Structure formats: C-alpha cells, structure tokens
A paper describes a structure:
The Rpd3 small (Rpd3S) complex recognizes histone H3 trimethylation on lysine 36 (H3K36me3) and deacetylates histones H3 and H4 at multiple sites across transcribed regions. The Rpd3S histone deacetylase (HDAC) complex recognizes H3K36me3 at coding regions and suppresses transcription from cryptic promoters via its deacetylase activity in yeast. Here we solved the cryo-electron microscopy structures of Saccharomyces cerevisiae Rpd3S in its free and H3K36me3 nucleosome-bound states. We demonstrated a unique architecture of Rpd3S, in which two copies of Eaf3–Rco1 heterodimers are asymmetrically assembled with Rpd3 and Sin3 to form a catalytic core complex.
Residue numbers in the entry:
A (entry chain B): 23 to 101
B (entry chain D), I (entry chain H): 29 to 121
C (entry chain A): 35 to 134
D (entry chain K), J (entry chain L): 7 to 42, 57 to 124
E (entry chain C), H (entry chain G): 12 to 118
F (entry chain F): 22 to 102
G (entry chain E): 36 to 134
The structure:
DNA sequence: ATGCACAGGATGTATATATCTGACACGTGCCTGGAGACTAGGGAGTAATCCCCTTGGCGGTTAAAACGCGGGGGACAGCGCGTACGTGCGTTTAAGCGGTGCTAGAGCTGTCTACGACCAATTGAGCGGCCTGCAGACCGGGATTCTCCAG
DNA sequence: CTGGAGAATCCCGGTCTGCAGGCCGCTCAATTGGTCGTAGACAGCTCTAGCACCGCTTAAACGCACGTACGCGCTGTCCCCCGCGTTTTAACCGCCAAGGGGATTACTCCCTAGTCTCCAGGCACGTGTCAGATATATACATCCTGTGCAT
C-alpha cells in the first residue's frame, strides 16, 4: 500500500543527476516524493474528470494529454 | 451607443448578502471584469469539452464538467450544487 | 602495503551527471510508478482501468517536471554558496515558480 | 578449512585477509575443481611452476573487486579458525603501530 | 400568458437570457442546450456572492460602508481558494497584503 | 524623446521595493530595475501597438493594453475589461 | 544636544508598513508617460494614447515590479543576507521563466 | 477542366483544402476568407521546415540518417526563438541539454 | 476507420530540406503534435482578433496579425514573408 | 556680520555652532523685526530676562532641525569673519583632543 | 619538511568490426474528401459628418528629487570542527520478460424521438440622462505610542 | 531594568463636495408560440486490449563500513548604504484652444456559404531491405597516488 516508497532513493538520485545536481541531502528524497505526489494528484484528478465526462471507465492517453495541456504542461508524442 | 454590463445584478447580489453596504464604480468595474473573465473561462472549457467528444451542443453537463475543471476544491462543489439546484428549479417550473 | 582503488567524493557524481544528461530513457521503475498512479487514482473513482499509453504519458510528464524542478533546486542551492541541495531549496524553487 | 566455497585466510606481506575458495588444485592430475568439477588448466588459467605442484587454491578476496582473484599455494592460505582471526588482529595492530610510528 | 423571465423561473439574480445570447454569439459551439445558460448564470451568481460577502466583511472590518478595490483585493488574497482562482490576476488599486519577513524584524 | 528611463528615479524604485517588503537595497539595484522595467514595457507595448494597427487605428486604447496583458498571462481587472 | 537620529533599519520598516497599506501609484506620472511614448516611438510613428491606456500600463508595471521585489527578497534571504542584490533579481527572473 | 490542388497553385506542400476545412469546422468564426488557409499552410510549412532542417543537422552531427526525438529536442532547445516558441512544451524521449554548472567542476 | 495526420507533408518537407535523411515514427508523431499545436494557437488568436473588431470573417490579415503576435522576432518576419508570397502566388495564378 | 538673513556663529559652552538669523530685537522699543517687521513681543515668543534687554537675535542652527530655534544675545553671537572660522576650527580641534584624551 | 611537477597502474569510456532484426520506406487498391461550376444575399468596403478627446502651451506652487556627510551594521573572508554525505562491496529483492487466459468495455451501427434552431408579434427589463444628500476626504490640534539613550 | 524626551502616529470634531443611488422615458432584446429537421439517446453487436496469474533470471536496490570534504558556527575588518538636513527641479494643477480621428450612417457590390457532380489524393494494408541494435575485442583519456626538486 506504500507505493510512494516504490519511488526509491536511487531513482530520485538519477533524476537529480539528469538535473545537474552533484550533492544531495538525506532529507531530499522524502521531500521529493511529496512534491511528486502532489503533481500526480493535480494531473490524475483532471484526467479522471475527462474520463467521467465521456462516460468511459478506461483512462486514455488523450485524457492525460488534455489534463497536462490545461495545467500548462503541453506534451508531444502521445497524440 | 449603449453598453451592457453586470452592474445591476452585482448590486442585487450585494444587497442580498450585505443590505447596508455600498460599492464604488471602480469596484463595480473590477467585479464586471471578474464576471466576464469567469464566463470566458467556463465557456471556453465547455467548448473544448464538446469538441473533444464530437458534440455540437453545449449542455449543462459540459458546464458542470468545466466548473469542476476550473474551480478549486470547495468552490467547485458549492458551485456544482448551486447549478444543479437552479437547473432543477428551472425544469420543475 | 596493498591499497584498494577508490575515487574521491565528487568524481562518480560528475560521471553520473554526464551519463544521465546524455541519454533519454526513463529513470523511474515502471511497475512501482504504475502502482503509485493506480493508488492515487482511487480517491477520485473506483475500478478505473488505464491504457498503457496513459501511464506512459504520466511517467514522461512527471519525470520531466522532476528534472526541471531539480535544475531550479540546484540553482537555489548554488545561490547560497553551497553544492548540496536541501529541502529549503525545493521549497524556495516551488514558491518562486508559483506552486506554493 | 580447505574446501570449495568455504572461507579461508591468506597472507600478503605483513597483513592478512579473508577470501573465498573457488578452485582447489590437484597437481598429480594437474586439474582444478571449481564451483560456479575436475577441469584442466584453461586457455587463460595458469599457475607458476613453484606452486603448480602443490595444493593450490584459486581465491577471491572479500572486500576487494573481482579483478584481483589470486592463485595462492598451500604456503600462505591457512584453515579458517578463530585463532586465525586473532592473528589477523595481531597483524592489524602491527600495521597500526607501524603507521603510528611512521607519523608519531 | 404574461412574460416571465427565465431568471425568475430559476430563482436567480443574473440574466439567463443574456447569458444564453452570449453563449450563442461567442462561437463556442453550433448549438446551445436549454439548461446551460441557467447553470452558467447560477455559477456566476454564486461566485459573485462569495466575493461580495468576503469584500463586505473586509470593508466592515476597516469601518466603511462601501466596497473599494482595496477591500476586494483583501478578500481575494486572504481567501485561499479565491487566491488560487485569481492567481494570475491584477486588481487595479488593490495594493498588497501587509506581510513582513520575520528575519527583517528588529532584534 | 530620449533618455526617459532615468525619469524612473531611485526614490520611486525604493518605494516599490518597500511595498515589496525589502529592508535594505544595494546600490546596483536601480539600473537593473530600470532594465527589467524597460523589457517588460517593450514586451507589453509591442502587442498593444499590434492590436492598435490591426484595427487601422492611430490611438492606443485601454482595451489594446488589456488584451496585450491578457495574452502574456497577466490579466488586469478594472480598466474596461 | 544630540540630533536624535534613528538606528539604521527602523525608518525602513516604518515605510515598509506605510507603503504596504496604501494603494496609490508610486512612480511619477509624467516621467512614466514620457517613457511609454519613447518606447512606442520605435514601433509606430505619430501614435496617440488614451489616458486610461497609460494608466493601465502603469498599474500593470508597478504590480509586476512589486511582485518581482517580493521574489527578490526571498532570494536574498535564502543567501542568509538582508540586502537585495542584482544576482537575486536575476535568479528570481530565471526561476520564474523570464530568463 | 482537370482538378488542380490549391497547394500547387500557392506553391505549397501542406494541404490548403484540409486547412480550410479545419478552419471552417473549428468554431473560430462564422466565415473564413479564401486566402486564410493559404497563409496558414505557408506558415505551418515554414515552421516545419525550420525545425526539420535543424533536426537533420543534429542527426548528422550524431552520424545518424534518421531523426529521433532526441534530435528534435536538441534542435529546439539550442535555437533561441524555437526554444521560446516551445517554452512550455515537453518533448517525450528527448532528454535534456548537457549542461553542468561551473562551480560543480573539480578545482 | 481512417485517421488523418500531417505525416506525408512533413515527409515531403523533410525530403526537400534533407533529401537523404529519414525520420522515425515517434519523431513524426511529435511533429504532428507540433503542427496541431501551432495550428490551434494561430487559429485561436485569429478568432479572438476577429471577435475584438466585430467581424464575422477570418481573413489572411487575421492570420498575419496572429502570426506577428505569437512568433518571436525573426520567426515572425520570415513567416509573414512566406505567407505573403504564398498568397500573392495563389491570387496571381 | 549681524543682519536679518545674514549668518552668525555663536558659542554654546566650550564649542560653537553656526546659525542663520531671522529676528532682530530692539529693547528700547521692545520689538522684534522678522522676515517671512517691527512687532511687539509674540504671544508664544519671549526672551530670557538677561538678554531681553540686550541686542538679541532669533537664530536657526545649520545641521539642526527647525525646532531648536534659540534667542541668543550679543554675548554669544559673534561676527562671522575669517578669524571666526579659525576659532571654530580651533575649538573643533580642542574637542577632538579632549575626545582623544577620553579615549587614549 | 612543503608546493610544485612527472610516471604509471586502475578504470571506465570511446572505436572498430560483425551479425542480425524489425522498423521504416515503398507499392497497390479504393473511396471519400476536395475541386470545378454556379447562385444569392449579406458582410464589408467606401464616402460624408460630427464632435469628442487628445495634444500642446503657459504660469504658479510646492512636493519631491538631488546632494553631501557621518557612522553603524551588514557583507564577506578566513578558520576550525565533526559529521553527514559519497564510494564500494556483499546480499536480498523484486522488476522485467515471456506466456496463457478471460472478459469488461471501447468502438461502431441503426432507429427514431425529443430538442434546439428559426421566425413573427408583444412588451417590459434594462440602458441612458438627471439630480441630490451623504460617506468620505481633508484639515487641525490635543493624546497616546514607539523608539533611544543614559543612568 | 526604567524614567524622560523627541518624533511619529492616532483620534475626534468640523467643513465641504463628488458620486452612488434612486427616479424616469423609451427602445430593443427577451419572451411566447408554433414549425421542422436532425443530433444524439438508446439498444445491440464485435472483438481489443486491459487485467490477472505464473515461472525464470538477473539487474537493481539495500545494508553497511569507512573516510573526508563540506556545512556551519565564530570572529574580525571595512565599506557602503541609511538617516537626515539643505538646495534645486520639475511634477502637478488649472485653464484654455485647435483639430485629428473614432464613431455613425447610408449605399453598394463582390465574396463566401450552400449545393451538386465527379475523380484522384491520401490512407489502410502488404513486403522487403538496411540502419540501428547488440555483442565482443581494443585504443584512448582521465583519476589518483607515489616519485623527485628544493625552498
């Protein structure tokens, strides 16, 4: 049930490395998880909204694309 | 010519909530701009919803979904309840 | 008299920064992120099914967001004459971005 | 003491280290027995002549990379016991005092 | 029968007919349902009522009987969800919230 | 019309920073603030004049400025809307 | 026989409180009008201006500058300083997205 | 006479008729002019050509004959105006530009 | 059924600029998303411009003004040049 | 030296301060003349009895605020001249010497 | 004994060749979406009119800007410490992949019913113009608060 | 701590005025009632892909030891920005005058929507190479610690 712990410390470290971060405090990882969770909520909610307007039960890639577009994060490569 | 605004309806609502409170012309202009901006946001989102689902009509379901998409938290739930109440009262009478 | 070889602190880190700024693959594991997505999508609706491309797009967007936030966090940490990122750096970055 | 996969100790100058055995040598048959099995000397495996005729052991040292595997004869490798760990600490203190004399 | 406005039919203060005309004239869709202007007018009326109530509280706190842009700004920025809604909006002659960082306080 | 950015004086920038909650200001801040203000004004006025020219007008109206501000993600209430 | 001067930083807080309470414009109007006209000179010649357009420009510009100073102050406090510096402004504008 | 496309008349490679249909059916205005789809198709083709030229350059610098998302990301982010145009756009499987801050380098 | 895209035209433009360079399917999908996004931005800005001036027609002047409003610096100049050249060639022919 | 609007330099203890004058007194007529003016003594204006009968002047000090205006007579108000500036610097130097003796 | 400057072993990164695959490019059938032709009427272009509001000038007052200066306190640089990070190795874990299986639900088609556009007559809600009393702005002088320093 | 002193602000009457709010005439957009066509609600069918289970395999995560470099507290210097008095400038107000251009109204005409007919551009699907993947076997380039020079 603790699926936020599945976003492990090495993965956050890899993301920081791609972000150009050399040294990472020990308190970062938990903090990072929090931020990620919030972001996901803000997207997933909106996605589900579209899924419920179309009277669908399956969330499609276009619902995610629309939620991202309306939150100011346009994404290419998924339709 | 003649220009239309929401001033009289804003004044009615103000006298409903605060019967002994006035309002200046600048504040009324700001409130009119607020109403117009919210109208544009909701209408544009409803148009996008209709287009996404291959529909030609903007119904109250599109308005409700746009309100849920554009309003945060408790505002969205209260607005949805108010809109449902208004539509029910309109359909009954 | 035998010594074991080991680089100094800050060498493997730079090697990894060069490695991961060169590739484009996703960095989070797929099944854990899928379980996280499916759990978060339960305070909204029950028995939701997901297209594979939906989860793929979610992972792309979330990793891009995290990488950009880490870049801003690194700038914030450097501004304070440091090389280590701390939670206050993330908080300041999100406050200036407008998220807070 | 001396078995495939069992722990053993090994000398190096004035210090000692724990290693894991993987190939035990029989010189009369010129074959090593290995665990992932009597097999001859390989296309790259080879032992010097002063230890190829004795009971040799191909060991990998614990705490050291897999590039430093060593074919040690019966001269250095001892049977793993607590007295061997006591000697390990003996040489550890020897090196500690030697370095402390090098500085102080 | 005598004319009865749709606003009075739905029990609203905002004009349902004007909202319907604006929805039809805005190139939003080919056609507009009958219950969409009622819903939209109800939502706009509720939001106007919320902001007006908070601004009236903020005006009575400052001991005045009229709402000025300063009171609207105070009401919006003190309310968390209204601040989220009008987060990228500038209210003319509204000023700012009086916030001072603790590290700058005299010590 | 030349060298009017120096009409945005140091006391005015100081008052703007006081309203922002700033207690102590380095002396190299005023020129940077003038440059930032120039960039912002150029970006807004370019779009305002584009709107004015599309209408074949010669005077910039408040609505042109409002639309320019809205296009840049800065909605302004209270100027005609 | 002492001039009775205040300590460095109390008048600054006093005017912080003074200007965080009022709502009027903080820039002079004629210099800002001249600056607006000079900037617009390079996009179209013989342009006219409504007074409300200049008013809207001034309101938006001062709101923008006040918000930028609010971010600059956080950036300066992050460096454990009390004085704002141009690098604070640059970092704020870069994190916002303007750089 | 025989059918001749409008893109051929305008000297374009993008479909003028399809853009005209997408303008008519998109709820943008009541009427669409005759020269609007031609202008729009020309602008779209110009932007596509700019991006594809830069991405082909990037693919050649990597000694590849096919453009992948990485080349598009490099082309967009290394060009200043194209980076400003796609400021809030996330390209999937594109990565980031290789950039390490100076103070993090070994000194 | 059949789903339309801009793939063939992007491929023709690619073979004009780099006559020996290919393109993968993911990159082509990204280019299709880019074309759709630009189309939507320009059409929306043109519609807003038409509504602002109380006009029912989206002409090429609306497109030109939208392009000048949405594209930065030299991109706007070059795009306007291409659009004017295409319109002139289309009308003359 | 001594005129309305003209400068003056007057003692105050072991130091002097330089001021600008606004009122000229006349004890024979008991009236002051000022500039924005033979006028009787003010309802809020007065002079100490040791200088109200002498040639007094209402001075405003330079470097001081507009509230330290003082009625000083010819006992302290001296003639602003070159020697006056010299003795101003002289008592400034002696004040510096006294401060250094308080410190070092 | 300390900062400089080489030698060299370790190690992880880039090059070179080779083999294989599946992803891209090309080829063919077809069908529906665009092109050609034509009509009508209304949106837009043009010309005349007006009168508003934008620009320009000039004089007087004084608020605000500019300027000079002494001094506090804040910036910043250097130093010492200890501990919280990085590195690397042995071990455990679960992700990844391939496979089999089932069915919920996405997607599509056909029918026809109710709902929304459209139009003609009616009229009252809302806009504009006009007026006026009071909420609020502006004074001014006592009252009270806040800051500073000296004891 | 702790009175005083000086400055800043607050408070409470008294006067004056612009505009907020109410009234009024009128007109044009909302309402009502009836027609009609078609969008989508609804029911049914297909078959796609999403969820579930399971068995190997090995890459990755995890735990832990060790050490060192960095974050942080502390101290000292100096310089630069603040508080404040004095002089200077030009912002603001008021008042007026001319005319440019935005808004309005009438008239016309051409250009775009609508409709029909037709045919080829583009799309869906089927094949076949070869660019890229993947694997293994070598040059480089750095990292880093041990050499010497000698100050």
């Amino acid at each position: 049930r603790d699926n936020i712990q599945g976003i492990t410390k090495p993965a956050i470290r890899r993301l920081a490395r791609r972000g150009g971060v050399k040294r990472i405090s020990g308190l970062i990882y938990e903090e990072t998880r929090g931020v990620l969770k919030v972001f996901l909520e803000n997207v997933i909610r909106d996605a589900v909204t579209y899924t419920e307007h179309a009277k669908r039960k399956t969330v499609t890639a276009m619902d995610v694309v629309y939620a991202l577009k309306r939150q100011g994060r346009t994404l290419y490569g998924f339709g | 010519t003649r220009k239309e605004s929401y001033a009289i309806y804003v004044y009615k609502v103000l006298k409903q909530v605060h019967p002994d409170t006035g309002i200046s012309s600048k504040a009324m202009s700001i409130m009119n701009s607020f109403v117009n901006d919210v109208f544009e946001r909701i209408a544009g989102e409803a148009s996008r919803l209709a287009h996404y689902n291959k529909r030609s009509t903007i119904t109250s379901r599109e308005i409700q979904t746009a309100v849920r998409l554009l309003l945060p938290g408790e505002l969205a739930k209260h607005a949805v309840s108010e809109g449902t109440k208004a539509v029910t009262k309109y359909t009954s009478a | 008299v035998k010594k074991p070889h080991r680089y100094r602190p800050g060498t493997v880190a730079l090697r990894e920064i060069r490695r991961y700024q060169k590739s484009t693959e996703l960095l989070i594991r797929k099944l854990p992120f899928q379980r996280l997505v499916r759990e978060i999508a339960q305070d909204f609706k029950t028995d939701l099914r997901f297209q594979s491309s939906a989860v793929m797009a979610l992972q792309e967007a979330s990793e891009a967001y995290l990488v950009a936030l880490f870049e801003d966090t690194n700038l914030c940490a450097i501004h304070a004459k440091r090389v280590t990122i701390m939670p206050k750096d993330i908080q300041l970055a999100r406050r200036i971005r407008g998220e807070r | 003491e001396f078995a495939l996969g069992g722990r053993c100790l090994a000398f190096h100058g004035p210090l000692m280290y724990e290693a894991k055995i993987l190939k035990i040598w029989d010189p009369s048959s010129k074959m090593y027995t290995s665990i992932p099995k009597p097999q001859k000397l390989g296309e790259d495996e080879s032992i010097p002549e002063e230890i190829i005729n004795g009971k040799c052991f191909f060991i990998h040292y614990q705490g050291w990379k897999s590039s430093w595997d060593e074919w040690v004869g019966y001269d250095r490798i001892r049977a793993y016991n607590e007295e061997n760990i006591a000697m390990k600490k003996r040489l550890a203190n020897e090196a500690k005092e030697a370095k402390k004399s090098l500085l102080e | 029968a005598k004319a009865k406005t749709r606003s009075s039919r739905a029990g609203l203060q905002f004009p349902v007919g004007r909202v319907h005309r604006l929805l039809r004239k805005g190139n939003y869709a080919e056609r507009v349902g009958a219950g969409a202007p009622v819903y939209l007018a109800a939502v706009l009326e509720y939001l106007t009522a919320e902001i007006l109530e908070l601004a009236g509280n903020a005006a009575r706190d400052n001991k005045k009987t009229r709402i000025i842009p300063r009171h609207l700004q105070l009401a919006v920025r003190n309310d968390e969800e209204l601040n989220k809604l009008l987060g990228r909006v500038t209210i003319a002659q509204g000023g700012v919230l009086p916030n001072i960082q603790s590290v700058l306080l005299p010590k």
